[PDB]
Amino acid sequence: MRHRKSGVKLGRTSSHRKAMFQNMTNSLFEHELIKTTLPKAKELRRVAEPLITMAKEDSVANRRLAFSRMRSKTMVGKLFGTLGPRYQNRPGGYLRIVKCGNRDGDNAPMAYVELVDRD
């Protein structure tokens, strides 16, 4: 069973899945629009949006928490310099997922992840 359990597996180890979603969060913070697999896009909200919520308030401790979970100093600077301010008064929902068909190489359902308010 998996009654009430959250999270994903995605055919990876735990540390691989953590690394992949850290990579995906950095890529989304950089480009503001990324094409990915639909299950990955849905799980990406649960890891990318809390970083925006935390960057809503700028402090040394919060920037260090962002860096511990993101490991990208340029993306931490961007997250606390443009995305925190932009989404300051938005109660969540900083990403929008737009389904965009199926991948050629393996027929994976695909989606576009967009930062809300320009991307």
Partner: protein, 53 residues
């Protein structure tokens, strides 16, 4: 572990009576007028009156 007789073509085809290609639901985008998969953006980036590129 293996069949004692070859299956007849009739029974082989009765087992395939459930094979069926999936047919996608389609809609017309309000802005562009273009056909698209329902709940999916158009090939050129339009979904529910919103651009993506």
């Amino acid at each position: 572990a293996v069949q004692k007789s070859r299956k007849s073509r009739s029974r082989r085809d009765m087992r395939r009576s459930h094979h069926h290609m999936t047919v996608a639901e389609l809609s017309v985008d309000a802005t562009t007028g273009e056909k698209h998969r329902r709940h999916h953006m158009t090939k050129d980036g339009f979904y529910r009156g919103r651009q993506l590129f």
